[PDB]
Structure 1
Amino acid sequence: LKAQALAIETEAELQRVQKVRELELVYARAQLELEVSKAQQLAEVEVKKFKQMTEAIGPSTIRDLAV
């Protein structure tokens, strides 16, 4: 009888754990997508501002400015 009751409550636990982890996996995938989108856009505007600034100052001057 203990075996029958443990079988029922184990099936009932495992279905809930399956559904919760499935929806959590979908939501974590969407958060990852938004995360890398923000990372690459902020990296792109950083790269573009740096490129325009070191273009406007000239790469020859930065060769002999740090010392």
Structure 2
Amino acid sequence: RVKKVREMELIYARAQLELEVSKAQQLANVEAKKFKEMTEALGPGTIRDLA
């Protein structure tokens, strides 16, 4: 009884992990690409002077 529940919750957790990592993945690619465009918009010396 318990082993089937544990096994079923196990595969669900594995796929729920894929949900979590994909959420972290894509939300960071956009976070990094936006930072890519943000710092490219200003300029290498310009951002240094601003900071």
Query: Of the two, which has the highest radius of gyration?
Result: 1
**Alignment partner of 2:30 out of 31, 41, 45:** 45
Structure 1 runs (4+) deviating above 3 angstroms are none
**Equivalent-residue separation in structure 2 for 1:33 and 1:53 (angstroms):** 29
Unaligned runs of 5+ in 1: 1-15
Q: CA RMSD in A?
A: 0.7
Alpha-carbon offset, residue 60 of structure 1: 0.6
Aligned length: 51
Spell out the pairing of 1:1-67 with structure 2 (5 A cutoff).
16-66=1-51
Unaligned runs of 5+ in 2: none
Identical positions, percent: 84
Taking CA–CA contacts closer than 8 Å with sequence separation of 6 or more, which of the two structures ends up with the larger relative contact order?
2
Normalization by structure 2: what TM-score?
A: 0.92
Normalization by structure 1: what TM-score?
A: 0.72
